[PDB]
User: What shape does this take?
Amino acid sequence: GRTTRDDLINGNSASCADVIFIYARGSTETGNLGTLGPSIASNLESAFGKDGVWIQGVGGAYRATLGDNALPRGTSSAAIREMLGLFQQANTKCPDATLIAGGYSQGAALAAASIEDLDSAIRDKIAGTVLFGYTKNLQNRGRIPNYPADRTKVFCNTGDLVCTGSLIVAAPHLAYGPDARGPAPEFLIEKVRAVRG
Assistant: This one.
């Protein structure tokens, strides 16, 4: 933990964070950050300061329901609406914040779909996005539609079947902890500092 973070919903628009991180958990995971999000968050807080970054999980209508992986975009329409609404909150509350995003498994599909759909002016403020166990990795050829490769980092372990077109969960799918502790926040921090200094 903390596995629930609502720093954007509870954000002070007169004291905006420099960086706002919006993260979607995997299927059946707890809180709004699940198993990987808190590790990313602690590293972001150290890099930007506790008051310099807002950590926001995708809660609300995102139920992280296992069966929704089988829906067209790998998550539900209601979930996409929730994550889009959070990106819009960030844009409205803190128009000069640099955004960053991420997701695990269904949450990676949700991040990709939401980012695809977002108004381009808001999408263009997401300096980096990390995807773990990306369930649309094969189908989307390793990319988030409408979003540049340089700003994307996919963590797809060998033998994680969801990265090669399946929805079956095998052991490598449970081995993203090291990535969440190290290279994923490293990438986000790098990409934010690239644009912010």
Remarks:
- The chain is about 30% helix and 15% strand.
- Strands lie at 19-24, 53-57, 98-104, 126-132, 152-155.
